[PDB]
Design a protein around this ligand. Structure first.
Ligand SMILES: CC(=O)Nc1ccsc1C(=O)O
Ligand SMILES: CC(=O)Nc1ccsc1C(=O)O
Ligand SMILES: CC(=O)Nc1ccsc1C(=O)O
Length: 358
């Protein structure tokens, strides 16, 4: 890599790893389109396995970007539309509060206060139906944003219904394969287990446990190389051969709602570039990110703006990830770690890297 990039990356990540006590980390910088890779530390402390460019990390909520793009692709195919009532694809959702709640609301956390997590007590598909049927909205549709796995998770599950494919099959055939993400998985295959990092939570080695709508909301695992390709694909959707996928990516980066300085896409979140570093850094803290906030409708949505900071924060019990990119600049970063360390530290590091290179 160019010395400039190396110096910028190392001066930023070294003290981060030290401050946060991160066991293992992989970083990719996309500079003028190309990828440059950096790795530190351990995928498995016990077995002394280093982080490599082939190491799989749990993406956590960064998985929502894939869900958003897969959803976008389904819209491009004419299989669904964001203006459809939720009941169009789940007719058993007959309870009256579901009148007026569309796929858009589900995809953008604006249904009216669906909870962050699906209750752990939900074990069966009958349990899941009951949960949504009995759920009482705090607010009218499209008035408040509340970040929720139970919201985008349901969107993901319903978006693939007309296809007649399972969520995993749809994701694999329509997103992973066309983009050549051959080491990106919802379920890690036995063949790839050797590369699967352990997450670390309070010193303990952990992997994400099964849960309702896990695949749709937080269930993707990936390598630093595949995530770099994912950034490249989102930076330049036009170079993608598969028409509906190209359009899906653009739909995902469209601006549907505004809250403060931020815009809600499908999975992706965006801010106007140049950004105020304090608004991305402070805004990434869960104090703000997980809070219920009033939204202003963007009527109609603004097509993907190239002058944007597009990004997504993501975590599991044992992992912390961050992806950010600026289409206008052909510039991006992926940060994957096997520790959940605070969002603002992630965004601060990303800012100081991308700022230095722009
Ligand atoms: C629909 C789904 O994700 N599966 C489901 C529903 C209730 S529990 C559960 C699971 O996967 O554990
Ligand atoms: C094939 C299939 O799953 N179709 C289905 C299931 C719930 S809604 C829907 C559709 O095609 O609209
Ligand atoms: C897996 C999951 O629910 N992640 C979660 C919960 C609150 S913030 C967050 C994330 O992935 O950033």
């Amino acid at each position: 890599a160019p010395q400039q990039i190396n110096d910028i990356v190392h001066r930023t990540i070294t003290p981060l790893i030290e401050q946060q006590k991160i066991p293992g980390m992989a970083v990719a910088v996309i500079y003028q389109g190309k990828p440059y890779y950096f790795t530190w530390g351990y995928a498995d402390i016990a077995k002394k396995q280093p982080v490599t460019q082939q190491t799989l990390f749990e993406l956590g909520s960064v998985s929502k970007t894939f869900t958003g793009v897969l959803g976008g692709d389904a819209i491009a195919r004419g299989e669904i539309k964001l203006s459809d009532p939720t009941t169009k694809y789940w007719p058993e959702l007959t309870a009256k509060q579901w009148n007026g709640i569309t796929l858009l609301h589900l995809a953008t956390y604006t249904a009216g206060g669906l909870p962050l997590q699906v209750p752990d007590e939900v074990k069966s598909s009958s349990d899941l139906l009951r949960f949504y049927q009995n759920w009482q909205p705090a607010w009218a549709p499209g008035t408040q944003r509340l970040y929720a796995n139970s919201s985008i998770g349901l969107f993901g599950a319903l978006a693939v219904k007309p296809s007649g494919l399972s969520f995993e099959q749809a994701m694999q055939t329509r997103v992973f394969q066309p983009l050549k993400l051959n080491h990106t998985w919802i379920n890690v295959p036995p063949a790839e287990e050797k590369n699967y990092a352990w997450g670390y939570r309070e010193g303990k080695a952990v992997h994400v446990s099964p849960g309702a709508l896990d695949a749709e909301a937080y269930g993707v695992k990936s390598t630093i190389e595949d995530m770099a390709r994912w950034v490249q694909s989102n930076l330049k959707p036009l170079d993608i051969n598969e028409k509906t996928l190209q359009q899906g990516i653009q739909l995902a980066q469209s601006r549907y709602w505004q809250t403060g300085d931020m815009y809600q896409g499908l999975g992706w979140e965006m801010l106007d570039w140049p950004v105020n570093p304090d608004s991305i850094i402070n805004g990434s803290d869960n104090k703000i990110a997980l809070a219920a906030r009033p939204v202003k409708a963007i009527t109609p949505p603004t097509p993907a703006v190239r002058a944007s900071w597009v990004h997504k924060t993501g975590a599991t019990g044992g992992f912390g990830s961050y992806v950010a990119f600026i289409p206008e600049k052909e510039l991006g970063i992926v940060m994957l770690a096997n520790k959940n360390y605070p969002n603002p530290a992630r965004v601060d590091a990303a800012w100081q890297i991308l700022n230095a290179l722009q």
